[PDB]
Amino acid sequence: KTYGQSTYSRQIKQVEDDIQQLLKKINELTGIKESDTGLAPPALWDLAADKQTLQSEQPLQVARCTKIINADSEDPKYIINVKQFAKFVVDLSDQVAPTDIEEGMRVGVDRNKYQIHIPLPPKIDPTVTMMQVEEKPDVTYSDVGGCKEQIEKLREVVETPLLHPERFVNLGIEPPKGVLLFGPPGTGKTLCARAVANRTDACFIRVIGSELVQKYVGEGARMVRELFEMARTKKACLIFFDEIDAIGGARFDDGAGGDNEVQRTMLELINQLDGFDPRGNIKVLMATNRPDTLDPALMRPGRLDRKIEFSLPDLEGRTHIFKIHARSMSVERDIRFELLARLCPNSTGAEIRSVCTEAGMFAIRARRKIATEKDFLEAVNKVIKSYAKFSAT
């Protein structure tokens, strides 16, 4: 049937479980009002349901939101629309200062007398609110070993001018805000993206290349407007594009009835990228697998300045990636990986992780604690032969 793997095996298990259930039985015994179609449990809003909700009732009115057009001379005399209700010539309440009520502003106004009460944050739609990462994955630069030249080149661009805006002033130069990455897939571009975003110290913004193609005309551009708006607002923010081939790869016109809309959108990215009052403090990181079928306008420097590529490790990048994907796992003290990488003349870091994790699967299926060194030998053997007579290869 079974055996006692560790001494009091169930003796901790059911002892934990029955008191866990007793935590519930305490709650239903005491009486809990659950499933009241979207409310809070009474234990914490009973002592909040008092007149310290009327303090939210009377002191704060409905505060209908509206949008500002312009002002007048010597006085506010503000012209405002609500959204679709009507346009009025209204004035601010005495609770505000006649400074931060500049035009094109979403402002809260009284429902009764139509007087401005509050300045608001401008509008930003969810479709782009969701592409802002708002988080930094833990991707350390050491995890991207095997591209010392590339990570250095990128370091000179996205990192050094920002964290040290001193040398470039002491010599009088401008950093190349435009970086493109390319090379064969499964190589260390994404990793570089996540790692740079780790120490980004900036409003880093993901962009998925296909997210822009849409059903209506110009709306994708309307995205781009909000993009460069949130960019210019968030000082020292980064932008990442990925597989931009969908955007503007060519200008197919022999039979000019093919792709045009994302061509126009690509033009909007052109203008709002460079031309007519440059952006200021922004950095652009791109990456594609086929940087060969793109419109040369993006290929113009100033926009896409550096062309960093990630190659296939000759013999030693695969060794170090054995040290990267083989390090974060349990093995015996009898390691050696040069023997391994000498066995895989052509394999990527991704395949390296595939062999490292495939190493564990033997002990995993063979009821073992860890991937023993010799088990890792068996792993590289089955992946040496597997990759030797691989399906596609």
Partner: protein, 62 residues
């Protein structure tokens, strides 16, 4: 309407260099009239105004 590096009359094909002087197409370049202006300093000053001193989130408030 005339240049200053060669007194050659021009008219509407003259130039207005930073140093306030007009030049012909041959002398429009700062290296053809010895322009006495610190382009490097207006350098170290424009880049300093356009360059946002980034701040690693640390020692903010109280």
């Amino acid at each position: 309407n005339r240049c200053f590096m060669c007194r050659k009359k021009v008219g509407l094909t003259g130039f207005d260099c930073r140093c306030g002087n007009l030049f012909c197409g041959l002398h429009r370049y700062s290296d053809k009239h010895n322009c006495p202006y610190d382009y490097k300093a207006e350098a170290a000053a424009k880049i300093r105004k356009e360059n946002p001193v980034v701040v690693a989130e640390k020692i903010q408030r109280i």
